[PDB]
């Protein structure tokens, strides 16, 4: 895992590019990743 640096990140098939930062969002056990108003990924949980 890398943080605070642009990367080609992949999470269980969800692919994207950019920086990661500590999340203030409170997910629920069934929830895996988070989307925003514009239907784009905004927060993701480490599967490990």
């Amino acid at each position: 895992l890398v943080k605070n640096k642009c990367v080609n990140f992949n999470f269980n098939g969800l692919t994207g590019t950019g920086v990661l930062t500590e999340s203030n969002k409170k997910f629920l056990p069934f929830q895996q990743f988070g989307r925003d108003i514009a239907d784009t990924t905004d927060a993701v949980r480490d599967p490990q």
Binding site: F30, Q31, F33, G34, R35, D36, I37
Partner: peptide
């Protein structure tokens, strides 16, 4: 016998987090 379902039969459509949307 029969009855009325007011607001039952609702579930999370997918394993996706959202907020105030």
């Amino acid at each position: 016998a029969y009855t009325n379902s007011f607001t039952r039969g609702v579930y999370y459509p997918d394993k996706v987090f959202r907020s105030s949307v």
